[PDB]
Amino acid sequence: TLEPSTSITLAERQQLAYDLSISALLGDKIYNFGELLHHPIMETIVNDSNYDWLFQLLNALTVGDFDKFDSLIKVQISKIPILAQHESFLRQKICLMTLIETVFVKNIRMLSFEDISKATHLPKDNVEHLVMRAISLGLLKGSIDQVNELVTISWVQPRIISGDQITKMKDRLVEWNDQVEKLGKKMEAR
Amino acid sequence: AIRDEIAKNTELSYDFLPLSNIKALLFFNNEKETEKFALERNWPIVNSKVYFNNQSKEKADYEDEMMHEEDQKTNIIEKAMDYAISIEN
Amino acid sequence: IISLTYKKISLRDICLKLNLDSEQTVEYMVSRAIRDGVIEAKINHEDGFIETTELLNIYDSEDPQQVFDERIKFANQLHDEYLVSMRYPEDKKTQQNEK
Amino acid sequence: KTAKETKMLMNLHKEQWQSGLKMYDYEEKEESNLAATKSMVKIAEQYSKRIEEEKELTEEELKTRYVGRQDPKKHLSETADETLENNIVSVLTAGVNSVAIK
Amino acid sequence: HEKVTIAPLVLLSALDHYERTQTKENKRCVGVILGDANSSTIRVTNSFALPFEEDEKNSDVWFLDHNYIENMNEMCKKINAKEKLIGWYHSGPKLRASDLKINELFKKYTQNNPLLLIVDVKQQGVGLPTDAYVAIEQEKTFLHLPCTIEAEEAEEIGVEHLLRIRLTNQLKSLKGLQSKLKDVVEYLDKVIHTILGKLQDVFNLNNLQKALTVKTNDELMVIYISNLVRSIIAFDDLIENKIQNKKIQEQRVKD
Amino acid sequence: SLVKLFTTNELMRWPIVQKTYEPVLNEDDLAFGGEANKHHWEDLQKRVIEHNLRVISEYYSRITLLRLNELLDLTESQTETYISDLVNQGIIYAKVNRPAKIVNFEKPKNSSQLLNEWSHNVDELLEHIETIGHLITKEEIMHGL
């Protein structure tokens, strides 16, 4: 976002958005396709004429079906396997961010290969090689277990998302304050 | 009182209770009398078997500094250090 | 004696040693001691042998720590009953005139 | 010292200034410094053994033999402060309660 | 990043200058720090206040005299040749158009990046009445730097003449957790993501912890071993008093 | 790409890659000599197995031995040969259980537990005091004005 610098017409904004669209197709770095939605990029351009590629891939992460997105696009961008490979990393990434607090309120960290199979549109045997390529490229740091089918990661790039996320973030800090009323008040009486 | 004591022998420790055997332990003539004793003692019932899930004990009013505490367990050791300090005081 | 030396042992092997009455009699006597945690074992009626449930390996547990915290105060028990006893005679000692 | 000089100096230099680390003050200096500080506590306890065994061996007869006085009190005060620091740091390792959970 | 070490004499003299000028809440005080910025740790060995005038109701009203800077800098050359201008400090919690525009004014006389300092005259909360801030651009962005208080050998000893453990760390650690609880609440009402990105990153830092339960009991095991040595401390005092008791019973006999 | 291939190589396409492109691989008349191509297949196959087990240990902490044999394109007698060679020569070290069929990374227990690994728990909460320091300055300027 820069008002004075880079003054271009309306036609060149959609042409620049086309370069911003094809930039994130072949890599997952710097958040995801939904990062440009919060910035005045997708909201400043029309939703048709193949300018919606950044918008459809955001909802495709939760749906997890390549055939739905491949039907709305052309053969040019659908013939590159890099787009299909690097899209699966972002689909599990949402499930990878669930390891801290999403559903379970006890902060229990467990990952089953069957939950991410339908989300990433990948079989169970290829899950071991999917997470293996993530460590080699420096995407995630952690260790995995093939025997118990358990994955534990340190962090990836926690997103700017809000709502139910920030609501659970406050609950974890309450446990820090709960020890003040439990363990903290006992030490003050000593 | 005899049947209640012999039943508690295989209750707490011994986990998964049989069907026809426990009838002979407590001297039951009818099999329907066996199920009547299970309802009063709250025995979990499964298919063709009777288990016991109550082995774990908790609650029982309040307990402090006894039976595997959590926050107070650390203060017990910390109290021993301040104990020798309070004597010199 | 026979339960600690023998982990997995059948039902009729005990009656042949101590010359007990029957198999139903020994089954009730073993289940009596497990109430207070004496034998610390289980009776499997399906397989028909008694197995000892004590695997030891309690060094990593907190059970020895309960005795450790008690023995910290046991040493301090003789400390508070002693230091006071030093000054107890010293009053009349220092009040008397010394050569 | 005026009213401003009283609050400023006590917040800057009084004995030694540990503040600004206040949550990590004794936490980082001890529990987070365990890399090498007290490391190999089993050897650290062996040090207290050699210090006590040396002076306790001097007079076991409670009389004049090796000509000494405070020998039993030398190892008493040295290993007392070390043990006091060994216990406080160890109990506060899990006492901070960082809430690790799983 | 870099580090900042401020001597206690600089902060002690900076607060009294606020009283010497009789500055009320409607105005703030601005001054210059002197030291060596060449190293990675910025140190302030000297400071002096400036007659800074400001209107609180108007952010476009400020008064900064550069003539006193040129004369004071020439006077310090005959005092200490190793002292140069590394930046400028200022008072007040707020950062407004007055303090941001003058940041480039001191840059003309300062070779390196001028070090920004927010000085709290009322000393409100925790420690560190003055925080170390560096100016950097991507809009003016002020990043915080670690601020340590360290003085010379005779400086720390001289202050002690003027003023002449376990529970302490716990009470100070609980105050940090309470400050975090209000940190997420005050920030939540401001939005309705940059800071939350760094917070959610360090939150994750008993599948792998199943074997990590024993290490808690391993340290508790040494504590009892230490208490065994701690008990020996008083076991000698148990022997030490009987060393007197044998001489105590020999007193009444001689009397 | 063949240099970085050792990381992701499953040895499934290994015979296919050498047949499609064979500049130095199968048929090479420059900087090489011999009576046949056996020196190309035997030397290359032994290396790609040794370079594969290096990255597998750095990624998989605990893996089933049955699944491990499928990745090496070997048998029970061939898999034990390359494992015993890397350990005896001081290359890598891992756990191999024949009856349990479980392969582990053999994590060292000499870290002295809380004497070292506890440094990771303080870095969990360490960055908070720094990020709060940046927020206090930024929050009051934007929200106040």
Swiss-Prot record, chain B:
Q: Supply one GO CC term from the record.
A: proteasome complex
Task: Please give the superkingdom of this protein's source.
Answer: Eukaryota
Name the UniProt key words of this record, in alphabetical order: Proteasome
The organism's taxonomy opens as:
Eukaryota, Fungi, Dikarya, Ascomycota, Saccharomycotina
Q: What does this protein do?
A: Acts as a regulatory subunit of the 26S proteasome which is involved in the ATP-dependent degradation of ubiquitinated proteins. Necessary for activation of the CDC28 kinase.
Additional information: Present with 9890 molecules/cell in log phase SD medium.
Q: What is this protein called?
A: 26S proteasome regulatory subunit RPN12
Family per record: Belongs to the proteasome subunit S14 family.
Listed GO biological process terms: proteasome-mediated ubiquitin-dependent protein catabolic process; ubiquitin-dependent protein catabolic process
Species of the source: Saccharomyces cerevisiae (strain ATCC 204508 / S288c) (Baker's yeast)
- Keyword Cell membrane attributed: no
Curated annotation (Swiss-Prot), chain C:
Task: Consult the record and explain the modifications the protein receives after translation.
Answer: N-acetylated by NAT1.
> Where is the sequence biased in composition, kind Basic and acidic residues?
87-99
Phosphoserine is found on: S61
The record's similarity note reads: Belongs to the proteasome subunit S3 family.
Miscellaneous comment: Present with 16700 molecules/cell in log phase SD medium.
Role this protein plays: Acts as a regulatory subunit of the 26S proteasome which is involved in the ATP-dependent degradation of ubiquitinated proteins.
Q: Quaternary state and partners of this protein?
A: The 26S proteasome is composed of a core protease, known as the 20S proteasome, capped at one or both ends by the 19S regulatory complex (RC). The RC is composed of at least 18 different subunits in two subcomplexes, the base and the lid, which form the portions proximal and distal to the 20S proteolytic core, respectively.
Under which name does UniProt file this protein? 26S proteasome regulatory subunit RPN3
What organism does this protein naturally occur in?
A: Saccharomyces cerevisiae (strain ATCC 204508 / S288c)
Curated annotation (Swiss-Prot), chain D:
UniProt GO MF annotations: cysteine-type deubiquitinase activity; metal ion binding; metal-dependent deubiquitinase activity; metallopeptidase activity; proteasome binding
Mind telling me which GO cellular component terms the entry cites?
cytosol; mitochondrion; nucleus; proteasome complex; proteasome regulatory particle, lid subcomplex; proteasome storage granule
> What post-translational modification information does the record give?
N-acetylated by NAT3.
The Gene Ontology biological process annotation of the record reads: mitochondrial fission; peroxisome fission; proteasome assembly; proteasome storage granule assembly; proteasome-mediated ubiquitin-dependent protein catabolic process; protein deubiquitination
What are the record keywords, sorted?
Answer: Acetylation, Hydrolase, Metal-binding, Metalloprotease, Protease, Proteasome, Thiol protease, Ubl conjugation pathway, Zinc
Subunit details: Component of the lid subcomplex of the 19S proteasome regulatory particle complex (also named PA700 complex). The 26S proteasome consists of a 20S proteasome core and two 19S regulatory subunits. Interacts directly with RPN8 and STS1.
What is the role of this chain? Component of the lid subcomplex of the 26S proteasome, a multiprotein complex involved in the ATP-dependent degradation of ubiquitinated proteins. RPN11 is the only catalytically active member of the lid and serves as the essential deubiquitinase of the proteasome.
In which family does this protein belong, per the annotation? Belongs to the peptidase M67A family.
Q: In the UniProt entry for this protein, what further remark is given in the free-text comments? A: Present with 16400 molecules/cell in log phase SD medium.
Protein's name according to its UniProt entry? Ubiquitin carboxyl-terminal hydrolase RPN11
Curated annotation (Swiss-Prot), chain F:
What stretches pass through the bilayer?
A: none
**Locate the PCI domain: which residues?**
1-110
Regarding how it is modified after translation, the entry says:
N-acetylated by NAT1.
Q: What miscellaneous comment appears in this entry?
A: Present with 5710 molecules/cell in log phase SD medium.
Family named by the database record: Belongs to the proteasome subunit p55 family.
Q: What does this protein do?
A: Acts as a regulatory subunit of the 26S proteasome which is involved in the ATP-dependent degradation of ubiquitinated proteins.
Q: What is this protein called?
A: 26S proteasome regulatory subunit RPN5
Q: From which organism does this entry originate?
A: Saccharomyces cerevisiae (strain ATCC 204508 / S288c) (Baker's yeast)
Recite the lineage of the species: Eukaryota, Fungi, Dikarya, Ascomycota, Saccharomycotina
Please state the gene responsible for encoding this protein: RPN5
Portion of the full-length sequence here: 298 to 442 of 445
